[PDB]
Structures are given as C-alpha cells and as structure tokens.
Amino acid sequence: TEVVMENVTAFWEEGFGELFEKAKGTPVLKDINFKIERGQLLAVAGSTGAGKTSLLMMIMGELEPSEGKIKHSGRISFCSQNSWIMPGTIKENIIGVSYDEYRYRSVIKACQLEEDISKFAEKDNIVLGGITLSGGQRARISLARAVYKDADLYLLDSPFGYLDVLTEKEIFESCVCKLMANKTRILVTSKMEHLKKADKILILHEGSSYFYGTFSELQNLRPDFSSDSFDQFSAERRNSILTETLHRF
Numbered sequence: 001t002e003v004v005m006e007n008v009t010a011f012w013e014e015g016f017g018e019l020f021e022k023a024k025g026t027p028v029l030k031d032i033n034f035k036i037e038r039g040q041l042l043a044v045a046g047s048t049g050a051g052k053t054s055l056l057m058m059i060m061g062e063l064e065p066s067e068g069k070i071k072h073s074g075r076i077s078f079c080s081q082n083s084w085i086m087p088g089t090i091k092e093n094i095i096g097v098s099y100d101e102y103r104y105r106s107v108i109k110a111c112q113l114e115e116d117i118s119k120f121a122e123k124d125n126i127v128l129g130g131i132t133l134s135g136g137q138r139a140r141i142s143l144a145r146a147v148y149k150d151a152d153l154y155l156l157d158s159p160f161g162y163l164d165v166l167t168e169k170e171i172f173e174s175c176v177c178k179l180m181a182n183k184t185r186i187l188v189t190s191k192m193e194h195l196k197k198a199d200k201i202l203i204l205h206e207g208s209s210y211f212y213g214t215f216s217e218l219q220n221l222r223p224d225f226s227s228d229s230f231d232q233f234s235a236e237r238r239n240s241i242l243t244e245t246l247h248r249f
C-alpha cells in the first residue's frame with residue numbers, strides 16, 4: 001500500500017478538533033504532507049513531543065484529522081518504543097498462532113535471535129515472562145514479532161532501545177533494509193544514518209513539518225541544518241541537539 005498525507009491537521013481533544021473541521025487549543029500535528037510508495041521507507045525524526053508517535057496513531061485511526069486527507073488502505077503492524085513480552089514461548093511471542101517456517105527463520109536471523117534461542121535446552125520452546133530477558137533481547141523479540149506479522153504497513157516507533165551502537169546498525173541493515181525491502185514501512189528515529197538510507201524523510205518540530213523529502217534534498221535545501229560522531233551520541237543527547245537546531249531554524 002501507498003501512504004499519503006495532504007494538509008493534515010489533528011487535535012487530540014475531540015472538541016477542539018470538531019471546531020477546526022467546522023471552521024475550515026494547540027494541534028498535535030499541523031499541515032502534514034508526505035507520500036510513500038509501496039515498498040518504500042519513510043524515516044520520521046524530531047524533537048520530543050513533536051508528534052512522531054501521534055502521526056503513527058493517526059495512521060492507525062487512533063487520531064482523526066480535522067482538515068486534510070490521509071490515504072491508506074491495508075493491515076498495520078505496529079512496533080512500539082516500549083517492548084512487551086507475552087508469558088509464553090519465544091516462538092509464540094514472535095508468530096502468535098500463524099506458523100510459516102521460512103518466514104520465521106528469516107525473521108529470527110535478521111533480528112539476531114538465533115544465538116539467543118540456542119542458549120536454552122527447549123530452544124524456541126523456552127517459556128518467557130519464567131525466563132527473564134535483557135532490554136536488548138526484549139527489544140529484538142518485539143521487533144521480530146512486528147516484522148513477522150503479515151501486514152501491509154509496518155510502523156516502527158524507535159524499536160532499537162537498549163541495543164548497543166553496533167547491534168542497532170546490523171539489525172537496521174538486516175531487518176529494516178534487507179528483509180523488509182519490499183514492505184511499506186515508517187521508522188521513527190534520531191539516527192542520521194537511517195535518514196540517509198531512507199527513501200523519504202520527515203522532520204517534525206512542535207507539530208510542524210520542518211522538512212519532507214530525501215536526504216539529498218536535505219543536503220540541497222538545508223546545508224546549515226546538516227552541518228559522523230552524531231549517531232555515537234546517546235538517545236537523550238541526539239534528541240537535545242536535534243531539538244535546539246530545530247528551534248534556531
């Protein structure tokens with residue numbers, strides 16, 4: 001499926017949203033414009049509270065526009081920024097109930113879970129919730145769950161938490177870039193590497209679109225904004241550097 005937003009403005013409060021819709025307090029998102037083709041990657045970046053998760057919620061019909069149009073048709077797979085583990089086996093946590101051996105093995109390889117599974121006698125029959133897992137292991141199982149699901153659009157809201165720099169790089173490449181090459185997907189990130197590899201980018205600030213386009217277009221239109229070691233900074237630091245640059249401009 002292709003996902004399109006045209007002049008989208010939305011309010012979390014239902015009452016103020018109805019007022020703006022009729023007319024045409026603060027919008028969580030305003031005048032949002034993007035278009036993603038089938039099999040493309042959109043990277044979403046921005047300051048804290050810019051409306052990144054809210055944009056995903058709007059795509060999932062949790063938040064409705066007051067003006068403008070959202071065009072999308074398809075099943076959505078959502079990977080939240082906070083991992084969750086069902087009391088059950090690793091396999092069930094990833095597949096649910098629908099099993100597909102080739103899809104399953106592809107996903108666990110791409111999320112580097114083979115080494116984790118081999119650690120136990122029961123293998124992927126090991127019961128979680130029970131066995132306790134590290135942040136990074138929980139993150140990777142959640143991502144594998146989201147990616148395994150048969151869906152038409154994959155929404156990945158900062159799914160690489162508690163993973164080290166090197167692991168996040170390998171999995172972004174193996175999962176998001178390779179395995180999911182033909183899937184329509186939206187990634188929320190503050191990693192300059194991911195914006196670079198994306199087909200389109202959207203940079204948000206206080207509900208407003210700072211920039212929509214390619215990373216090359218970001219080089220063309222925003223040279224002072226563009227101006228190696230950035231992705232080495234922590235999530236918190238990367239956020240406050242991006243925040244300040246968006247405030248200045």
Ligand SMILES: Nc1ncnc2c1ncn2[C@@H]1O[C@H](COP(=O)(O)OP(=O)(O)OP(=O)(O)O)[C@@H](O)[C@H]1O
Nearest residue numbers: 012013028046047048049050051052053054055081
């Ligand atoms: N379900 C909701 N109902 C009402 N307000 C909400 C809801 N979800 C988020 N908000 C508000 O909308 C604003 C933007 O939140 P959102 O989570 O979309 O930002 P974000 O960019 O994803 O933040 P972060 O960078 O911390 O993940 C915040 O003021 C938040 O409190």
Ligand SMILES: [Mg+2]
Nearest residue numbers: 052053081157
């Ligand atoms: Mg968020």
